């Protein structure tokens, strides 16, 4: 199947029993047994397995070309289950600018269980190699990252991990399985905040994990059954439903990204623009070799906090909110929202100025989105 | 408010905006901000807070006479969040017969993070005192326990915990807040598998935690936001809805329990009957001092595995399934289902014979339930 | 099965395929066919049939001791489908005080299709006989009625209908199948606003119809498939779920009704009290012969509009709202809400004074409900 | 707004109260009133109005450039409400090949209420004029029609209706508001089976109606409130959600239609192909003047029943089922499914041969869909 066909027919999303062309919502906690231990269709207790959740798990496995899928109550729960593959005394390497929620969990929760963490500039793979310790067991990378869209070489990271005996993990949220497939590049585990593009409609919080490794899958299943951060059946259904349109949504988003970037690069009120499609973006070549499309997150700098605040008030179609990947276009200012707890001098050295604006391109008309942002910039 | 009124009007379960008499289902992931950092009603991102989940959290806090409530994707997720209050090097004491899911998580997951566990016969409080170590930080008890309904003195456990500097935790699933309120007896944290009685309809998997301690609540909120085992909005709504009838359901269940036990005690095919209402049950007096009603779980022994298997096939109204607390009556054989991985000789020393049958009394007609089980026993 | 057992095990509310102990929610519109015309489980298109809707239809048929059940998008849709059994030129007799929504549909919609209607005092069965015309085809009665709880003799009405060649219909909303079963008394069709007691939680709008007559059922099915006022699958699920607790809810409501009426009859600020349990209520004897319990709707008179308005502001547990049958107690003033379009002089001749208050007793604690209403009355 | 922007931001689909970027699901039946008759936000009883249903009503009004929208429990319920604008003695003109469900309701239900119907070949507007009677009050047309995609001139029909004093109605299901807007061409009422393209995911049954005429809207609202075929809140939410991707879905469908038709026209096993894009299709010019895109329904003839049956078994990506407009491609044989009750000789004179196959193009990859159908045809 080509990609758009796989989004409709990959995995198991119909009812074998009635023929229903959509996955029934099994709002149930337990299953009758005909004889003790005799499970009619392999279900016994919804925390261990639920048919609607099993459907979305089969879909993400299919879309990432993995064997096993797992659905969690949030992206953070997916990350937590993966980190729980490790033991006290183990060390993990992550990219320097990792999601604030990943950063928080690792430095404030899992350090109390003896997991040690280092945040490394993974855009230079030599810095990965230099950071590996005897106790390192995992390499965890996002690419592209937030909010500056830094790109990390997935295939090289997978090779480094294999050579040094590490479990490799990619957070593939920003690219989605439609454009980037880490498992095909040798990564062990791929994961997503399905809250973003996969659900696509700003109406489900969910995490998804996929792997082809049977032993890691058994370990993940045991962690899931033992710590219980499972996705419910209604959210599993809405996620399956949202994924159906993923290809069309990302293709529209990508058309708009191209034109929006052109407008931003020409606008006199905009300084730097950050997106992996830009020729001068660091590791642009790496991104084009490992992905066949782009994320809809773009960041760009205006002069100062006052210009960013006024830019947002002047748009018609950009919704001021957290999150990304929705059908509606979204806008934020990282220094005031996500990164406000970081001292301003450190933020700036990290490349996040007070005037940095982040947008998540939605599926509105491309000309409307370009013209709306351009006229708002014109007021600065 | 008396208890039945509190189930309807405790907490916040209406919509201030429209006046809707039920909690709207906020199937949403993010919230528009008018100005940066200006939250219209305090919501910014559904993982951190969602109005439907906030509703069920307010209800469980009210019903347990606590200040703060937390809703998780499963009972196991609630337990995991509570255990994560501890650090590597800390020790926890739990009752000897704790739920297999609690047992699994603690011995196979959290031991890998340096949490050490001892399982103690908490029906004698001197055994609790004798087990406390310098590194003990938590005392976790279920009462009554599964499947033999062992009773632990909550008030004495709370006093021991306070004197020895331990966080006390009670799993109150089997009694519900309608009959037993550990926080009022000095316990620090109370938790539930809301999958069971609270939801009540076999159609939600969920965990709930309540506490009056502001600092423990801040620690729990941070763990929840960082590990993300949150309950979704549809499941939160169904849980709120199910809780409305909790008092009526438990009162019907309790009427049937009395008559069923009378019939079991007189039946020649039944040996021991286990339930805290029975006069000869160990710590019967303790149970009646700390609870004003009973659980609907009853266990009783028939001769052997063959008699239990045939008892189940002979009933009309008892559904062979895992779980408990449903409107439908349920039946199981622990030695073949929940405890089958435990060597048979150890099972028996633990008091679980091959002929032990567990029932969860539902809300069917009392005479029907008594007569159905009695005639099935008559076939043995 | 006794009544409480029938509410749990009557009809088909489990999944044969997985063993799920609750009805799956088939949020689907169409069904795969293996061969043309070969329906895997008899489903082809959800408007014609949907498994979740089929579940609630089987339940209402079971509870009313009928053969065929039908689920509609509202009580009004159920009534409309039943009236559509008739042709232009046909006449229908209804009780004099029929629900305003029934009254509206018949006099303003169906009269335009040539259906003629007369509203008769059916509390005297001779007035029914005197109203029958050559073209009369249907006798439609509510008992008890709203808001004065007038009682009509069901068995005599069924006999009159049979002798005169009429289809008999009872709106059984206020009594529910738990206490009154018109089909067992010879009535042809029974119907409900399932929005009220059956759903029970103020969170579903729905209608239900049951009959034992195969030919009327075929006519109803054809009307349903042709005019399409079908109940959706999520609402069908919530209705099935709510019905599980109907017996317990009505028994608690009935205990409170007895005590509330005692308090109202003794209170010096209350004049007449209207409820079929009252010895002096017209056709009290008829009600006790055809029902084995009571409705939770009670009406009572205070002095004037000012006393009713102030009574409502003074209660703690009575919610000012339309509808009835909820777990929360509700209060209204018919002259200001439901009947405000009727000239005040006609309202009074109909027995509805400006001071008439209607309450719907919920499942709060009986003492709380009695004391709350009594102290509010004390302020008058 | 351009069309793709209107699908995201037209109507009201956010929560003013919390800022939630999606419409909350108001699973509720009634609303608290602060003072008698004082509605906090204009809601009193969900049958009369529900905020989630009000959201989808605002969306369809926006997308059709109307003032008022109405949401019904099915397309058939929408049609029934519109027909109920008429009285006994009135006559309606409809296209000769109108949907079997419309045909059934009109000829078997509404004729019993004195509504008279004539089915006219509306592809020649002179046949419309010749059919108008003194009692004609309504002209109802589908364009394109099923299964032969016959095209009727909307603007001319609107002019004829205006001149002759008729209410004009277009069933716009097959084109959707994305490509054809009857209200802008002078039609009085537009309606949809939202079960098809608008929901788009084969998981909601729903009807929608829009109009700009205030008096017709008041009449429709009264009919809706009186006959109660209302869409529930969960289905209203899923419909709003599905509509977000309508533009992207229809654009992908249209790209595939072009290539599929090219392949069908060249295939030696295919005789006639029916679709309005084809140059030789009757009223092709009319269609291109009144629509700016195409439907995804295509019909084409193979030799006989045996070739159609074997064509279907030989495809990989075409699901044998009723309905259309889904993300998955669908296939059917009208003579065996929808039209099997029509004598075969009449079917053929109506242009429906035993070998006529209907497909509904979904959003799978265009090359996959073309190649799959072409190789299946190659087996004939």
Q: Measured between beta carbons, which residues in chain B are less than 8 angstroms from residue C241?
A: 201, 203, 238, 241
Tell me the count of B-D CB pairs closer than 8 A. 85
- Pick the catalytic residue: C26, C43, C99, C197? C99
The rounded distance, in Å, linking the Cα atoms of C136 and C94 is: 11
| Token representation of residue A325 | 């990947």
- Is the distance from CB of B199 to CB of B239 less than 8 angstroms? yes
Q: Is the four-CA dihedral B325, B328, B329, B335 of positive or negative sign?
A: negative
Tell me the count of B-C CB pairs closer than 8 A. 103
C-alpha distance from residue A298 to each of A102, A311, A322, A325, D268 (Å): 21, 15, 14, 12, 50
The rounded distance, in Å, linking the Cα atoms of C55 and C76 is: 21
Buried residues in B88-125 as b, exposed as e (16+ CB within 10 A): bebbbbbbebbbebbeebbeebbebbbbbbebbebbeb
- For D127, other C-beta atoms within 10 Å of its C-beta total 13
Q: Measured between beta carbons, which residues in chain B are less than 8 angstroms from residue A113?
A: 87-88, 113-115
The rounded distance, in Å, linking the Cα atoms of C234 and C220 is: 23
The rounded distance, in Å, linking the Cα atoms of D290 and D318 is: 30
Where are the domain boundaries for CATH 3.90.1150.10 in chain D?
246-378
Contact criterion met (CB < 8 Å) for A205 and B319: no
Residue in this structure with the two tokens 């800022």, named with its chain if needed = D19
Q: Name the region of A323 (left: φ>0; alpha: ψ -120 to 50; beta: rest).
A: left
Q: Measured between beta carbons, which residues in chain B are less than 8 angstroms from residue A222?
A: 108-109
- Pairing relationship of beta strands D91-95 and D116-120 according to DSSP bridges: parallel
Q: Where are the alpha helices (DSSP H) in D202-333?
A: 214-227, 233-244, 246-266, 284-290, 305-313
Nearest to A356 by CA among A101, A98, A150, A147: A147
- Pairing relationship of beta strands D356-360 and D330-332 according to DSSP bridges: antiparallel
- Pick the catalytic residue: A26, A53, A97, A99? A99
Nearest to C363 among B8, B22, B238 (CB): B8
The rounded distance, in Å, linking the Cα atoms of B208 and C106 is: 50
Nearest to B88 among A112, A226, A336 (CB): A112
Dihedral angle of Cα C131, C134, C140, C141, to the nearest 10 degrees: 20
- Is the distance from CB of D32 to CB of D40 less than 8 angstroms? yes
Nearest to A36 among B33, B34, B320 (CB): B320
Whether B178 is catalytic: no
Strand order in the sheet with B319-320: B273-274, B297-301, B356-360, B330-332, B319-320
Q: What DSSP line would sit under C182-239, residue for residue?
A: GGGGT-SEEEEETTTTTT-SS----EEEEES-HHHHHHHHHHHHHH--BPPHHHHHHH
Per 3-state DSSP, chain C is made up of helix, strand and coil in percentages (nearest 5) of: 40, 15, 45
Where are the domain boundaries for CATH 3.40.640.10 in chain D?
3-244
Per 3-state DSSP, chain B is made up of helix, strand and coil in percentages (nearest 5) of: 40, 15, 45
Angle, vertex CA B176, rays to CA B173 and CA B178, nearest 5: 175
Where are the domain boundaries for CATH 3.90.1150.10 in chain B?
247-378
The rounded distance, in Å, linking the Cα atoms of A45 and A51 is: 11
- Is the distance from CB of C152 to CB of C160 less than 8 angstroms? no
- Most C CBs within 10 A among D26, D42, D47, hence the mutation to make, goes to D47
Q: Helices B246-266 and C246-266 meet at what angle, rounded to 10?
A: 110
A30 touches chain B (CB under 8 A): yes
**Radius of gyration for chain C, computed over Cα atoms and rounded to the nearest angstrom:** 21
Architecture of domain D3-244: 3-Layer(aba) Sandwich (3.40)
Whether A99 is catalytic: yes
| Residue D253: exposure state from Cβ atoms within 10 A (0-12, 13-18, ≥19) | buried
C247-378: what CATH class?
alpha beta
Q: Measured between beta carbons, which residues in chain A are less than 8 angstroms from residue D360?
A: none
Q: Name the region of B20 (left: φ>0; alpha: ψ -120 to 50; beta: rest).
A: beta
A27 touches chain C (CB under 8 A): yes
C322 touches chain B (CB under 8 A): no
Resolution (A): 1.6
- Most A CBs within 10 A among B27, B31, B40, B47, hence the mutation to make, goes to B47
Nearest to B364 among C8, C321, C362 (CB): C8
Which residues of D carry out catalysis? 47, 99, 171, 196
- Pairing relationship of beta strands C207-211 and C189-193 according to DSSP bridges: antiparallel
Architecture of domain D246-378: Alpha-Beta Complex (3.90)
Residue B171 contacts by C-beta under 8 Å, 6 or more apart in sequence? Answer: B79, B99, B102, B140, B141, B142, B191, B192, B193
Q: Measured between beta carbons, which residues in chain A are less than 8 angstroms from residue D368?
A: 1-2, 4-5
Cis peptide before A33 (omega within 30 of 0): no
| Token representation of residue B126 | 């001197």
Contact criterion met (CB < 8 Å) for C248 and B245: yes
Method: X-ray
Whether C347 is catalytic: no
Contact criterion met (CB < 8 Å) for A114 and B109: no
Nearest to C113 among D31, D113, D205 (CB): D113
């Amino acid at each position: 199947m080509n990609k758009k066909t796989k989004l409709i027919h990959g995995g198991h999303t119909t009812d074998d029993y009635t023929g229903a062309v959509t996955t029934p919502i099994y709002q149930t906690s337990t299953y009758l047994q005909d004889d003790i231990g005799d499970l009619r269709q392999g279900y016994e207790y919804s925390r261990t397995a639920n048919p609607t959740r099993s459907s979305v798990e089969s879909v993400i496995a299919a879309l990432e070309n993995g064997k096993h899928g797992f659905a969690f109550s949030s992206g953070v729960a997916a990350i937590s289950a993966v980190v729980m593959l490790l033991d006290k005394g183990d060390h993990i390497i992550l990219n320097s600018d990792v999601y604030g929620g990943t950063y928080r969990a690792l430095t404030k929760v899992f350090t109390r269980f003896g997991i040690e963490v280092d945040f490394v500039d993974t855009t230079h793979t030599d810095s990965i190699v230099q950071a590996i310790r005897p106790t390192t067991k995992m390499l965890f990378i996002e690419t592209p990252s937030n909010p500056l869209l830094r790109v990390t070489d997935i295939k090289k990271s997978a090779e480094i991990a294999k050579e040094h005996g590490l479990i490799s993990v990619v957070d593939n949220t920003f690219m989605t399985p439609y454009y980037q497939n880490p498992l095909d590049l040798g990564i062990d585990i791929v994961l997503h905040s399905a809250t973003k593009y996969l659900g696509g409609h700003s109406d489900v919080v969910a995490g998804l994990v996929a792997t082809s490794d049977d032993k890691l899958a058994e370990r993940l299943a045991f962690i899931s059954n033992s710590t219980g951060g499972i996705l419910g059946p209604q959210d599993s259904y809405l996620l399956v439903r949202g994924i159906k349109t993923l290809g069309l949504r990302m293709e529209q988003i990508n058309r708009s990204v191209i034109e929006i970037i052109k407008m931003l690069q020409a606008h006199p009120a905009v300084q730097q623009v950050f997106h992996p499609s830009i020729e001068s973006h660091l590791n642009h070549d790496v991104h084009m070799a490992q992905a066949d499309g782009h994320t809809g997150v773009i960041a760009f700098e205006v002069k100062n906090t006052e210009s960013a605040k006024q830019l947002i008030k002047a748009t018609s179609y950009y919704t001021l909110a957290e999150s990304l990947g929705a059908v509606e276009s979204l806008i934020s200012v990282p220094a005031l929202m996500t990164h406000a707890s970081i001292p301003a001098d450190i933020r700036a050295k990290e490349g996040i100025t007070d005037g940095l604006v982040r947008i998540s391109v939605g599926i509105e008309d491309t000309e409307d989105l370009v013209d709306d942002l351009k006229q708002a910039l014109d007021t600065l």
